[PDB]
């Protein structure tokens, strides 16, 4: 209730969220403690500082008029509230593939550069965090303009969602589904970053004289900051500056109403006309939702940064950490072969769900990881050594039949070991999804943990098929393919 009480609570939140990492076995405990302090602050505040009287669809007409007055495309589509994705664009005429149907001039964008020239500018010029991280700078730009009734971007801000499905909005028990996964550490980090940043900037805005003119000084709630960073992370894009020599982060009105489907990037920046341009990803008949391809992200990144889980994401993947051990008697040769191949001795690789399960770099690493001393020598010495290194990432040219049997054996065993570190099985997750009635957010968490295991299980199965294939080649003593 009291301004002094909020100051004390934010000071405590700042100290808590600035402490070092407690160790992976204590990150859940720290997460709940941070949540407890955040929810105590949030329940003593009044939600979003600025709210609007109308419904969301009441403001899209003004968004169109504003965009039209500044040279954007406003014909051929309409805004529709779709159940699956929320609001999106629907075609009102047939749109052919590769047709330029959407363009947005730079003047409509909210950018780090427009953040500098705004009321936030003076604080930006002094505070080191804002200068180093344009995404946070974008979030405060968005909040400041939201709190400014005469802002040029009011038609855009009034049509933004009021809530998101980033993990910042999850209940404790919805995040608890993610325990023992790879994704949950990033959920922890996002919550700790956001809480730290809110507390830091709350204290800055209240005392730093360069924030004297900020509209946020009257009211700056945790809900404000959660909304602003979720708005930015689910919608921001990278574009070039007007000159084209640097890049910057931006919010792109109208275009950012398109929801996601599998495909290719069809949005580019036109520097000569200074506008964002989007060509149709596929044919869209009148009455069909207009989709774009957001980018080649994993489902962990879609959930955590984009606020949704995407079924049949063809680019999904999980991390796998591998390294040559310094206690290997062949460490020095293996490290040198990898170095000549441009591969580190230790790294985090990816496993993919689509074919093939492992990339050229991971294949090259696994081959060297399993090489005998005589194979390593042939990759280090003589007039063919460079040629041998060049084909290390190529599935068609193995080092030896036994080298392939060994690396696929190791991978099968490693992916099976990783599968055993999860708190549930694939069969159990599928039963929960079938026999429990769940919120959207809980389903996102369960499908994310299920998706991790399904990638691991498919790597297990593909490695076993590869192992048995190359074992047959070894038994038959078949001739090794040679590159020419």
């Amino acid at each position: 209730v009291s301004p002094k009480e909020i100051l004390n609570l934010t000071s405590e939140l700042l100290q808590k969220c600035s402490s070092p990492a407690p160790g992976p076995g204590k990150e859940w405990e720290e997460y709940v403690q941070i949540r407890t302090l955040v929810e105590k602050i949030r329940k003593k505040q009044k939600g979003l500082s600025v709210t609007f009287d109308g419904k969301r669809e009441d403001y899209f007409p003004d968004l169109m008029k504003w965009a039209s007055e500044n040279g954007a495309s406003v014909e051929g589509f309409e805004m529709v509230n779709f159940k699956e994705e929320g609001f999106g664009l629907r075609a009102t005429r047939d749109i052919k593939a590769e047709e330029l149907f959407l363009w947005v001039p730079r003047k409509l964008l909210m950018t780090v550069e427009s953040a500098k020239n705004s009321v936030l500018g003076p604080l930006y010029s002094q505070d080191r965090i804002l200068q180093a991280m344009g995404n946070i700078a974008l979030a405060f730009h968005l909040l400041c303009e939201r709190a400014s009734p005469n802002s040029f971007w009011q038609p855009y801000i009034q049509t933004l969602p009021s809530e998101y499905d980033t993990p910042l909005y999850f209940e404790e028990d919805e995040v608890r589904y993610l325990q023992s996964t790879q994704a949950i550490h990033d959920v922890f980090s996002q919550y700790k970053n956001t809480a730290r940043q809110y507390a830091y900037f709350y204290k800055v805005i209240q005392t730093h004289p360069h924030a004297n003119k900020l509209p946020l000084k009257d009211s700056f709630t945790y809900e404000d900051y959660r909304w602003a960073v979720s708005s930015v992370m689910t919608r921001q894009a990278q574009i070039p500056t007007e000159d084209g020599s640097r890049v910057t982060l931006a919010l792109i009105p109208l275009w950012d109403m398109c929801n996601h489907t599998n495909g290719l990037i069809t949005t580019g920046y036109n520097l000569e006309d200074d506008r964002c341009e989007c060509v149709a990803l596929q044919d869209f008949r009148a009455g069909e939702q207009i989709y774009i391809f957001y980018g080649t992200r994993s489902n962990a990144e879609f959930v955590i940064h984009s606020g949704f889980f995407f079924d049949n994401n063809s680019h999904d993947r999980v991390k796998i950490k591998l390294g040559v051990s310094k206690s290997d008697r062949l460490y020095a040769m293996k490290a040198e072969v990898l170095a000549r191949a441009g591969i580190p001795t230790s790294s985090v690789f990816a496993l993919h769900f689509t074919e093939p399960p492992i990339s050229a770099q991971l294949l090259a690493f696994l081959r060297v990881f399993c090489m005998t001393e005589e194979e390593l020598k042939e990759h280090l010495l003589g007039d063919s050594a460079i040629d041998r290194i060049f084909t290390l990432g190529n599935s068609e040219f193995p080092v030896s039949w036994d080298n392939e049997v060994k690396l696929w054996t190791f991978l099968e065993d490693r992916a099976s070991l990783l599968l055993k570190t999860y708190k549930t099985t694939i069969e159990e997750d599928k039963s929960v999804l079938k026999n429990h009635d769940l919120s959207v957010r809980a389903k996102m968490a369960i499908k994310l943990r299920l998706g991790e295991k399904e990638i691991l299980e498919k790597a297990v199965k593909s490695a076993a098929v590869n192992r048995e294939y190359y074992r047959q080649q070894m038994e038959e003593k078949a001739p090794l393919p040679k590159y020419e």
Partner: peptide, 18 residues
């Protein structure tokens, strides 16, 4: 292709201490 391809919701680093 695209000289300046635009990725919607591009992943950025929010760790102000890193």
């Amino acid at each position: 292709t695209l000289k300046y391809p635009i990725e919607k919701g591009i992943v950025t680093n929010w760790d102000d201490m890193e």
